[PDB]
Ligand binder design. Sequence first.
Ligand SMILES: NC(=O)c1ccc[n+]([C@@H]2O[C@H](COP(=O)([O-])OP(=O)(O)OC[C@H]3O[C@@H](n4cnc5c(N)ncnc54)[C@H](OP(=O)(O)O)[C@@H]3O)[C@@H](O)[C@H]2O)c1
Length: 315
Amino acid sequence: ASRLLLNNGAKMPILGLGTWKSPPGQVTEAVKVAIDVGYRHIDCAHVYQNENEVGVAIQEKLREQVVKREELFIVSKLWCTYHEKGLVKGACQKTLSDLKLDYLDLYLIHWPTGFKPGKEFFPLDESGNVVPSDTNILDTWAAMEELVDEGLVKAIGISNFNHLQVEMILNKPGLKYKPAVNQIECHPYLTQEKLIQYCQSKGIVVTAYSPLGSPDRPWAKPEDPSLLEDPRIKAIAAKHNKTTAQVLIRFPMQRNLVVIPKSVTPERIAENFKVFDFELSSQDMTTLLSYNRNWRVCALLSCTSHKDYPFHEEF
Ligand SMILES: NC(=O)c1ccc[n+]([C@@H]2O[C@H](COP(=O)([O-])OP(=O)(O)OC[C@H]3O[C@@H](n4cnc5c(N)ncnc54)[C@H](OP(=O)(O)O)[C@@H]3O)[C@@H](O)[C@H]2O)c1
């Protein structure tokens, strides 16, 4: 069942179901199965273009008495084109209506980079590059803070913020609500020891995304590394009579991180849940940490010149 305590007093399920790349015609069934299997945490976002269909499943399980709303922990994220002051509430209310809820448990700033407002998620000029907004992280944070004061979201947090951008928020004059969660990419090829040690020292819960290395990212190459087929990680799994995926999901949990693997496949959704009944030794953990290559799945390469691009700093 177990769960981590956030700085607003709420409890966040350490395992959750990710929904990026989950087709609209498959994800409702996926979330229904997840909730049946015992998932109490769904990770969503407006930019995934499937929140209506995630919301159909959540509504069905609520009507069915399988779960009450307080048992669920629903996360969504504010996209980059909605960073302006006047647009944050609207973006939150659209997500709430698609998911058919009246509050979110956690609302994240998806990326620290703001884009020009409009219908395109990645707006382009005549040269072909992303058009930035002149908004900054602190004004976007003040808008997120008033969503807490209005009752639309219980906790607010951030995603893909480096340590200096987190510092900015923590040092902000008149700061009312601390970031509850920083959601970052984390697996054995990108272990993130410095950013995790920093967030944890400030009471910020870390959520690991792409724990299996995201084998279905649309920009995948044949010569890219594969976590799931890594023989060294295969060997650790075999020693524990588990799968490589079960080892890769257990790895962040023992680092006190929240982990959110994605799947639309009912048998893998089930498999990914059976991770509470075994332990990796401290030797296993230290071995998996040694596999760090500093390799990112999600590098947002089109925004490399944006003033708030997060990955130029070391951590
Ligand atoms: N905040 C952000 O900026 C951000 C960025 C990236 C990701 N995320 C979140 O993190 C979630 C998880 O990361 P991700 O979607 O990149 O990828 P992931 O969870 O690392 O991997 C998903 C892929 O692995 C497969 N898989 C799942 N379980 C498996 C198993 N037991 N055995 C073999 N293969 C398995 C899935 O296939 P099937 O689905 O076909 O089973 C899918 O192809 C996303 O859905 C999203 O919610 C957030």
